[PDB]
Every structure is written in C-alpha cells, then in structure tokens.
Paper text:
However, a prerequisite for efficient transmission of avian viruses between humans is a change from preferential recognition by the virus hemagglutinin (HA) of α2-3-sialyl-galactose-terminating host cell receptors, predominant in avian respiratory and gastrointestinal epithelia, to those terminating in α2-6-sialyl-galactose, which predominate in the human upper respiratory tract. Thus to better understand the nature and significance of such adaptive changes, it is essential to monitor HA changes that may affect receptor specificity of avian influenza viruses, particularly during human infection. A single amino acid difference was observed in the HA of each egg-grown virus: Asp186Glu in A/Vietnam/CL1/2004, Val134Ala in A/Vietnam/CL105/2005, and Phe151Leu in A/Vietnam/CL2009C/2005 (H5 numbering). The effects of the single amino acid substitutions in the HA on receptor binding were also studied by X-ray crystallography of HAs in complex with pentasaccharides possessing terminal sialic acid (Sia) linked to galactose (Gal) by either α2-3 (LSTa) or α2-6 (LSTc) linkage.
Author numbering:
A (entry chain F), B (entry chain F), C (entry chain F): 1 to 158
D (entry chain E), E (entry chain E), F (entry chain E): 5 to 325
The structure:
Amino acid sequence: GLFGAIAGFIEGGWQGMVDGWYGYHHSNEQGSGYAADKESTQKAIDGVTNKVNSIIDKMNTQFEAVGREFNNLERRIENLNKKMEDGFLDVWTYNAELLVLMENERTLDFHDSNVKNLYDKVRLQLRDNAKELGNGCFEFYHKCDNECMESVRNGTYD
Amino acid sequence: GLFGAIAGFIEGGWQGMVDGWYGYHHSNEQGSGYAADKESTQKAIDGVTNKVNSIIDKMNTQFEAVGREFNNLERRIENLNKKMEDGFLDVWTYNAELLVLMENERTLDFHDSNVKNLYDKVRLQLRDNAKELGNGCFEFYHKCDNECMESVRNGTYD
Amino acid sequence: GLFGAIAGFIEGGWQGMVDGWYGYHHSNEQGSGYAADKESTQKAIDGVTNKVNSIIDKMNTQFEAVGREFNNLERRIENLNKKMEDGFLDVWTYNAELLVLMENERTLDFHDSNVKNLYDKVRLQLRDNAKELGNGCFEFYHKCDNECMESVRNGTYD
Amino acid sequence: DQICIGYHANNSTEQVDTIMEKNVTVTHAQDILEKKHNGKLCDLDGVKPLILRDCSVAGWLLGNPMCDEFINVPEWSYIVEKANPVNDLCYPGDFNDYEELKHLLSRINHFEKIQIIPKSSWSSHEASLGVSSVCPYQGKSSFFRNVVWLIKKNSTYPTIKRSYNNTNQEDLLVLWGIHHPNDAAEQTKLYQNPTTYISVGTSTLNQRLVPRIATRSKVNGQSGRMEFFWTILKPNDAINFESNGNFIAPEYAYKIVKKGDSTIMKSELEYGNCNTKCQTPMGAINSSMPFHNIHPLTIGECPKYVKSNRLVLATGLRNSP
Amino acid sequence: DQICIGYHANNSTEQVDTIMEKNVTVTHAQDILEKKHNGKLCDLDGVKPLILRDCSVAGWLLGNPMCDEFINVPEWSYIVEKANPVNDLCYPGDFNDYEELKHLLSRINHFEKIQIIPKSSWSSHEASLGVSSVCPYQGKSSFFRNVVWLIKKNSTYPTIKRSYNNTNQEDLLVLWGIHHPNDAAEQTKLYQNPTTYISVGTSTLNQRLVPRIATRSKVNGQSGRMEFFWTILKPNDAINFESNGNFIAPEYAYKIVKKGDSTIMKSELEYGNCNTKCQTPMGAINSSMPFHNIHPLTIGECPKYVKSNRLVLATGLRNSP
Amino acid sequence: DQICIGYHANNSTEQVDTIMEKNVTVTHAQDILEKKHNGKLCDLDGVKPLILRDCSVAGWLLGNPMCDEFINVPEWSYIVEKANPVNDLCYPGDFNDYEELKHLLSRINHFEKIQIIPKSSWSSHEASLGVSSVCPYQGKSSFFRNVVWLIKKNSTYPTIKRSYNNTNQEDLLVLWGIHHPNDAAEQTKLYQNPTTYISVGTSTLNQRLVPRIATRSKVNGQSGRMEFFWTILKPNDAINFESNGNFIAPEYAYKIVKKGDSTIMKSELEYGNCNTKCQTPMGAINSSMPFHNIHPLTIGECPKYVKSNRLVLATGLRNSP
Ligand SMILES: *[C@@H]1O[C@H](CO)[C@@H](O)[C@H](O)[C@H]1NC(C)=O
Ligand SMILES: *[C@@H]1O[C@H](CO)[C@@H](O)[C@H](O)[C@H]1NC(C)=O
Ligand SMILES: *[C@@H]1O[C@H](CO)[C@@H](O)[C@H](O)[C@H]1NC(C)=O
Ligand SMILES: *[C@@H]1O[C@H](CO)[C@@H](O)[C@H](O)[C@H]1NC(C)=O
Ligand SMILES: *[C@@H]1O[C@H](CO)[C@@H](O)[C@H](O)[C@H]1NC(C)=O
Ligand SMILES: *[C@@H]1O[C@H](CO)[C@@H](O)[C@H](O)[C@H]1NC(C)=O
C-alpha cells in the first residue's frame, strides 16, 4: 500500500489484538502482550465514520423515476422518456460505483498511513536506544520492563 | 494527515513565518529566526493554482436551463421537462460538491507531503552530525553559526 | 511527488535500466550495473493493468444518442431532445476527463511510493553497515562483492 | 526486550473492490446496497393502495359493470394496474387524452362519486334502453354505470340542452361520450336524426363532436365505437351539454377531494396484507441502506435505486492470512 | 544550536470541508460560489429588455388596447413576463399553438410592425363596428388593434377573397382569428350567413376553420369566443384568406428583423435602471466566480448554477491554534 | 562500494495531464480515444445499408417515380438519408405523422412489397388518368407508384366500398391519401361530386377525411395538395375504405418481415464499398479504443462517444531529462 507498512515492512496483522486497530506488542522478562493505541484508533474511527456519512449524504439527492404513459402514436416521446430515465440511472450507478471504488482505496491507504505514523512516532522516541529490526519491531539495548514499556506507549521515554 | 508532519510530529504552525508556506526556524549564539523555503513554496503555489484552474475549466461546460412552456393538456411533457432539468442540476451539484470535497483533502495532504519532503531533505544532509529531536528539530553536535545555518537551508553541508 | 523519491531525493531515472520499472544500481571492485527488482515491478504492472481495465469497464455503460425527428410545430420537444442528448454527452465527457486527470495523478504517485518503499526496504537491511548518501545510494563500510550485492537485492544481509 | 508496532487481523472474509485490486479481504466493511424485498404489495404508512386487479383506469372511472368492486373506493396511497387489464372498455372505443388523465391521477389520492344528472331526469328520451350484450352484468345486457346511453323516445330525438353547475368547493372530473354507429340505418334506428352533434361548453372548453359513421372491423362482436372525453370542471363553473343524438351522457362525476403524492404502478401482484414505508412494483422494502437495486419506480421513504449488483465500503483494514 | 522545519500559521478563520472531516480551518481558501445578486432587472450589455408588465405575450402581439405601451417596441435583449398577466386576451378565447409561438420568440430580438391589409380596404364589409366593451380603450368599446373584427354591411356578408404577398426579405409573423358566437341568433346578427368558414392558404398551410356555435359560460361577461391562429409567412410567399363571416382579419403583421439569443423570463420585478452582463429572474449577477446559486434560468456571461449553499476550496494548509 | 535504488527512464515523449500539472512526460502511456475514421459509408457486419441518395423516406415508401432504384430493396442494416432530399413528395403536400413513421422504421430492417388492391380492380372508376406533370417518369406525366389517383368514369363517381384482409402473419404498413383541389371547378372536373369524404376503418382506427378546398400558393406549379396517411394493419385485421372522390387509393403495401436494430442516419455521403463493425454519419470506425470523438450517432459495436480532443492515461512513471 502507499505507505509501506501494512503488508509491507510489517508482514501481517495481529489476531491477538482484539482491542483496537493499531497498537503495540511488547516482550520482556516479565512477559508479553498487546495494547491498542486508542488515540489513533479513535481518530481512525472518526474519519471512516464521517466518510461513510459524507458518502451517504452526497447521494441523498439522486434521480427518482416517475411512471409516465404514452399512446401508440407518441413513440418518439416515450422513447425520449425512456432514454432520459435510463440515462440518469446510468449516471448515478457510475457515480456510486466509482465513489466506492476510489474511496475504498483511500480508506485502505489511510489505515496504512496511520500504521506508519504510529511506527514513526515510536521510532523518533527510541532513537539510538534500540535497534530498528526492519519488521515493525525495536530491540532495546538496555533492559525495558513493563513501566519502561508503558513509557514508550504513552510518549515519554529515556 | 497522511504524511504525518503537519499537526503530527510537527505539532503546530508558525505565526512568525509570514514569508512563505514552509521553511526553517534556526537558533544559535547569534540569535534566531525564520526563513521560508522558496522553492518548495513556489512549487506548492503552482500546483494549487493549476488545480483551481483545472477545477474551474472542467466545470465550464455544465448544463444550462432553458425556459420552456406547456399548455394545460401537456402535463406529461412539462413534468418530463422538469425532471430532466432538475436531474442535470442535481448531477452537476453532486459533481461540484464532491470534486471540492475530494480535492480539498488532496490539497491538505499535498501540503503535509511537502512539509515531510522538506524535513527529510534536511534530515538526509545532517545525518550523524545532529540529534533528531522528534519534533521537527535537529540539535547540532558541533556549533553552527549563521553561515553553517544558511548552509543547511541551501542544501550544502559538512 | 507525494512520496518524495521520484525526481525528489532520487534526482533522475536510469536509461541503463531497460529491465523493469524499479531496481538497483551497484558499483564495486568487480564492476557495476543495473538489476530490475521484479517483484515490485510486477506488482506495479498488475495495479496499473487493473486500473486501466477498471476505468474502461466503468465507462462501458455511457449514454448512447438515438436519432429522433420532429416537425416544424414540435420545436419545444425537439429542443428538449437536443438539450437532453447534449446534457448527457457533457456529463460523460466530464466524467471521462476527470477520471483520467485524477487517476493519472494517482498513478504517478503510486510509482513514487513503490520507489520509496523499495528504498526503505534496503535502508532497513543495511542499517549501520552503510552510509546513507542522501541521493538514493548507500555507501558500504565493509567491502561488498557481487554476492554481497546480490544479498541486498534478494533481502538477506549481514 | 522488544516492542513492535502492528495492526488488527481477524477472521473476516468480507471483501471490497478498489481501482487497482478486486476482492481485497478487509477486517471490517459496510454493505450499503439493499438487495432484498418481501415480494408483496402492502399498505403505505397504514394507507391501503387501490388495487384494480382486472380493471383498467378507464374501466374503473367509466364504471364498467365488471368493475363493481370499485363503485366507491376509499382514499388510497397509490394505485396498482396490471400491464394488460382484461376489463377495460367493454364496448370497444378510445378514451380521449387518456394518458393526460392518468397523469392527473398520479397526483390524486381520493375521489368522491356524486350524481350530476339523474337518469330519471330524462323526460323526452329513453335512458333505460342504452345497453349492450358486450357489457354484461349478471347475464344481462348492461353498460358503463356512470354514463347514460340515451336513445330516442316514441321515434323522436329532441335537441338536448342540459347544464350542470359546480356547487362543490372541489374540482370535479366530468366524463361523457359519443357513439359512432357503423351505418346510416343504425343512426336512424337509435337516434332518428341522420346528422348529429354533441356540443360541450365550459369557461375554457369549446367542443363540438360529430359522429364518424363508417364500416369497420368487429371488436368483441361490435362495429360501433364509443369515444369518451373528459374535462376538469372548476368550482363555480358550469358545463353546457347540447346534443340531438349519439350523446353518451354524464350521470355520475368524481369530486377530487384529496391531492396527495401517488403513482399508478404496473404490477401483476395482488394485495399482500402488509404495511411498509417503501413500495416497489415487485415487493416492499424495509431497510436502512442508502441504496437498493430492486426497481426504479418506488413510492415512500425509499433508498436510491442503482443498477449495481454490489456496493460495499471498506471500514477496516486489509486483513491478513 | 538547533534548526527546525515548520510551516505557516496565521489568524485565518476560513474553513473547508473534506470527506473525512468537516470544518477544517485553513490558512488560505478560495470561495467559488456567488451567493449575491442586485435584485433588479437590468439591461444586458447596454440592451434594455422588453418588460411586458401587466401584458402577456398574446396581449402584446394581438395588440390588446390595454397594451399600448407596446405598439412599437425597440430591439430587446430578453423579454420579461409576469406569472399571471392581467391584460391578456381581453375578449375571452384561446391562442392556438401559443407555446410554440413563445418558443419562436425566445430566438427573436426584434419585430418591426407593418400594415398588410388596411382597415380602410374593406368596401363590402363593416370594419369599424367589430368592437366589445370587454376590450375598453379610454372608456369606449374597443378591440385588439392588430386584427379587424369584420361585420356585415347593409345586411350582407359577401365572400371575402383577400391575399397578401411577402415583398420583404424578412420572415413575417401573420396573425388572424375566428369568432365563435354562442347561438344561431348572433350568427345571423353579425354575419348574416348561418354556416361559415375561414380558409387560409400558404405554400405549406392548408387550413379551413369552422365556427363552433354552442352555449357556454360567461367569461368577463362574454359567451362568445375568439380563437387566434398564426403562421410564419416565408419571404416571397403569399397568404390566401377566404371567408364568408366570423373572420377576424389581419391588419398589422410583424417583420422578424433580428434573430438573437433571448428568453422569456418569468419575473414579477419591474425595470431597475442598471446594466449587467448576467441576468436572473430575481436579480442581476456581477462576479468572477465559476458558480452561483441564484436561479437556474439566466441569460448572459453567467457562472454555472449549482444548488449548493457553500463551495470553498482549500489553497493553504491546516491552520493551527 | 555503493548500492543505489532507482527507476526507469527512456526516450519517451508521451505526455499526460494531471489536476496539478499539465504535460508531464511519462515513460509509458495508453491513449484511449479514437480520433480516426475511414470517411465512408460501409456495410455493417456484411449487411449493406439502404442508401436513399436523392430520395426521402416519403419519396421511397409512396414510390415517387424518381425513386425507382427502390422499387424492391433487400434487407438493410441501417438507412441513410440526405439532410434535404430533392426527390420527396413530387406532388406537393404533407405526410401525416411522418416522424412517428420514421420512428417505426428505425426498428425495421426489411420490407416486402405486396399488392393489396389491384389497379385493374376498378370497374366503375378511372385509374389510369390520375397523373401529373409534376411527377414525371421518362418525359411523361406520372405519379406515386404505390397509390392510385382515382378519377371519375363516364362523368360519375359511385361510392367506393373496398376492404382488405391481412392474411399475412406479418404486420402490414398501409398507405393512402386525399387530394385537396384548389377550387369548386376542379372538384367537379375530377370527382363530379361537390362534397366528398374518405373513411377508413380498422379495429382501432375510426377515420373520416374531408377535402379542404381553398386557394393557395403554387408549389412546383401546383395549387392542389396531397395529404398522405398510414396505419399499421395487424395480422387478421381488415381495413375498410369508403369514398365518393378525392381518394388516393392503396395499390401496394409493405409487409414488415424483419424487426432489427437500425437507424435513419443523416449523411451526404454515398456508398463506400467497405465493411465495418461501427458506422458514424461521417465515416466508419475500426478500433479497440474505449472512447471515440467522431460523432454521437453511431450503430454497431462502437466505442463510447465523448467530446474530448485528448484522453491519455499514464501507465509508466515521470520520465526524466
Ligand atoms: C470469527 O469467526 C469464527 C468462525 O467463523 C467465529 O466462531 C467467531 O464468532 C467470529 N468472531 C470472533 C470473535 O472470532
Ligand atoms: C472476486 O470474487 C468474486 C466472488 O464473489 C468472484 O465471483 C469474482 O470473479 C472475483 N473477481 C476477480 C476479478 O477476482
Ligand atoms: C489577521 O487578523 C487580525 C485580526 O482579525 C487582523 O488585525 C490582521 O489584519 C489580519 N492579518 C494579519 C496580517 O494579521
Ligand atoms: C460546521 O460549522 C458550521 C458553521 O458555519 C456549522 O453550522 C456546522 O453545523 C458545522 N458542521 C459540523 C458537522 O461540525
Ligand atoms: C527510443 O527513441 C529512439 C529515437 O526516437 C529510437 O531510435 C528507439 O527505437 C526508441 N526505443 C528505444 C528502445 O530506444
Ligand atoms: C501542453 O502541450 C501542448 C502540446 O501538445 C500544448 O499545445 C499546450 O498548450 C500545453 N499546455 C500547457 C498549459 O502547457
């Protein structure tokens, strides 16, 4: 994906993180586990919720067909009426299918972006104090217990 | 935003940079201040100017309503005419509202991108010679006067 | 471009890489040359091929004009018919021109992204073992022959 | 010791399309296209439709004797008519400006039928004899119940001069007709006079109908032809009839009590004993989807019709194996 | 010592919408929707409209005596007509193919009125007596100034055979009429002959009008009816009139000098003494915005109409607190 | 020792537009708009069009003697007609509901012409004399070959009562006419009777035509007027003609053998001796482009018409100097 994190340098998702959309896995002497990052998850939830609502709203004023009858010697106007009603239903069908297609791609990339931004936020804190593994993980140089671990998660470190 | 710089790792904008859209703040023994980066600002100005012109042009061939009258026993064709004229005005209203919505988001992200690219350009020069602070700033290891400072800005360093 | 690699930190393309869309240039005691990265090139080829096919498909249901005649005292309906047929041809012309414009920009950025992702993949392997030059190149600290070179290309190193 | 950044996967099988890639599996999705309906005709917000069955709008309004179910119909929400109703125009003919009338009906929810000229109002002409075997009621020769086929009395057709004033607040739909016999003998037989006319006058109408007497194909064993006309009589206006034969005359007319949003939908379906907020000709819709792909012609609080087979938005992220 | 990368903020309050977020404050923006107009009817590029006021297009062309302001009108840019003009058709009737005529007018900027048959051209018939109190001028019984209501002279209506040749380069709009009396007595009284006809001939027109004599409602105290017809007489073609009564005859006709882009706009507004490049029925527009949301029916160099309340593009970046 | 990441450049000159930048040079591109055609009228999938040349659809169907090339035409794919065909309606007139007929034709690929009433079927009337010099064939006075201009025999026009039954499975297009003389003398001269009528009857048609006898402009040296009518006679239905003069009578009628997708295209081009899958009025199209900008009115397997001058997609990347 455009931002290179999802199914890119981070090879796959986490079944064990039931908690939110993005977060951390940690691993040390005391144990290991997952913690959702709630700020970026909620931010992600708001964006996608507004997008869906924007999409639905923007489409609430589509063309509505009206029943309309014509006798045997009004074939030109009947056909005109037909091609007009079908013409609009085609315009709106295309409008709807493409909006979904384009926006689906924007949504996938947005998630990717959020994952990369969160990765970088942690990278910028750790700096020298850890080896960047290449896979979404940082290996610490000096032992890092749960409170140190909590420290990376909330954005305080060193 | 997608590129993580604007209102992301760089927490807020600069009231004191009146000069252009992106630039530098520097701070040393001799003093401190702002300098716009004119190349990327101008590049940004051209892109947004063309976008506006593209948007305006692409819309210069919208549907124009024509006045059209019908007697008391031509109600089917009057209604057809009505729903046809309204149908197009709805298609164009949606076209215009969505183009603006989608492009507004593209413009915001473009600015973000430009800020990140400029950040990275400086990061790639400084390399080891400075501590990356995590906030848009680089703290130098060896004293850096105004001419050294000018040196980062124009893309010559070391 | 949004991702800063194409005609950004990597100043220009390679006439000598006839082989694929993205790849590597290497240079050591034994010699120098180009090697396409086939995985990301093919990935790029699939995406662009599907986009073209999606664009063509989505447009296979545009409005078709029908010949339609009217006598001297049916001028209101003739004009209605005219403005209706032109109205749709304008909607579809705009639809087609804009889809191309927006998607052309998406395609250029996609290539940029692919170049950046490939750059970063190599950067994440090399780590300390090379100087990041700022220009798309990595200068090795310890001599790197062809098999070492092949080693970066396939994603095994150290 | 190690900390990692990562993202959610789950067991989702939900798929979305993009421009560059079809069938991407996503952790979460939102389908926005309603594909289902209940296959019945239902009431719209409690208000039952007018279901014509085997009767056409013409057969109903003129009061074809096969259409007695519709002598007096309650306020409706929409009207349902079959594609080819069998009980229309039992005595062959045309209905003048029929589609412009149907168009008025699509903006009417209620009629109240009132008597304008009483059948036992004709002293000089025979009312009770204008009946055909092509319009049977209970095995006997009958006729459109709302119009009176006037015939000569004691071998005479005096000039008719009859007039109705609209002392209702409401608009009134008035219907009349003319008979086109197939030869000179029939004209003599029914109306006595060889050369006839019907003349209708309101404040905006200036009509003079003349019988077109020619030989033509039998339709349901009939060579004659009825041609029905209509007008909307404004309140406080008067309709002036004048004829010396061939006059098919108003008995009942319709008061337009209520104007409501409505349609005449074409459907072969019968009543389903249900209620709904959204009706299509193929079945009713109950959903909170923005779109549906059932049928273009709906009435009610309806999703927008698209021609798609599938409309699914991504919400979650690309789901991994 | 420290160097930082950053971006502009300012005191902007300007807001734009996106798909994912409404009301983002931006450093700079460009509004592209014109929401304002001057509320007047104005000249279009110096060229004053034809403002009918209380007269309808029919009232104007036939020359209703209440419409004298429009005896001779200069080249216009567009025409303005009220929704319900009071001075139309002073003597009740219909105007045949009226909307198709109005449609021709929307592609005409100038008429020049010329006399085709002089009133003092009728030797065998009484011109000066065809006048009604329903069409008053200065307290006296008058009539449409462009057509002549011919009546019998010394109790006789000889067959009229009159013909006009178009020796103008231009197309010529020709108007005539027919009177439908309400009884046999009036027919005798005005035209003597019981059974009449008007016959009109050009190279493409084959017309025969026959009076429809029936009893009908009074409209403005009148039971009779006028029915007006028109044709466009090509240059070098001749119109052939022939009638033995009920003939409302051409006196003046219109030369179609100039064809220009124009409309008949519906507006209750009067003249505003302004000039503009873009006129709507509600007011004029002066702006360099691409769009506007004033009214769909404009004329001139106009922005495109959308139904939006707001269209604002971002140019600058997300503005920080 | 150094390794570098990079991307392809080549010698491409191909340019694409974006929202923010026009004329970006790309390494690879795909043009999707067809701008070329062969400028000829061609067969559509082997099946040759009906190319009328100087004959109009009216001139063809009525059988104008100048249109003999079209006495018997094979199945076509589409029909081509010039904007202003010279050989139409050699004897001046109108063709009633002409455009609704043309509309039927756009959904018909084949006619088979059959004789319904034989010319040598008239015992009491003169067939062979209904001919004009305005409709010449080989220097002699002739007439529409498919209709018979009946004239009086031995100074008599007996009432005609003729009837045709459709014993073809197919629908049958039937054409007839009426002559409008320009004075009382011509009526006497041709038909004897002063006051005439034509009456046509089918199961759905109730027609009575009456000659409109008035003085009018000469058109191609003629003051008289022909007015042609048509109906589609259903299989197993009968058309009933009855007239005492002015009757232009069916000789030949058209069997509607094949219904196919077709159009009447307007084009001044003649036959090009080519085959194609896609025809425009300006030339044929052979391409696998999704779009084209040739002309809106095509027939066949065609790309979609857009009004663009240029539609080019990027596939490759931004090409460097
Ligand atoms: C996931 O899928 C499995 C199998 O379909 C199902 O048992 C489970 O309820 C779903 N949801 C969760 C929470 O796993
Ligand atoms: C996508 O998956 C659907 C299964 O619902 C399948 O029918 C379709 O052919 C697939 N499309 C492609 C191009 O893979
Ligand atoms: C910014 O806003 C303030 C207050 O609205 C105003 O005084 C000033 O002129 C604006 N522009 C600048 C340059 O600050
Ligand atoms: C956005 O701000 C406007 C103020 O002009 C307000 O009316 C509107 O409700 C706001 N919309 C949302 C969803 O915040
Ligand atoms: C590139 O362009 C040159 C000159 O136009 C031409 O000779 C060559 O065939 C093209 N393609 C390649 C492979 O260079
Ligand atoms: C783009 O290049 C074309 C050459 O085909 C030229 O005509 C056009 O003016 C150029 N447009 C711009 C804005 O550079």
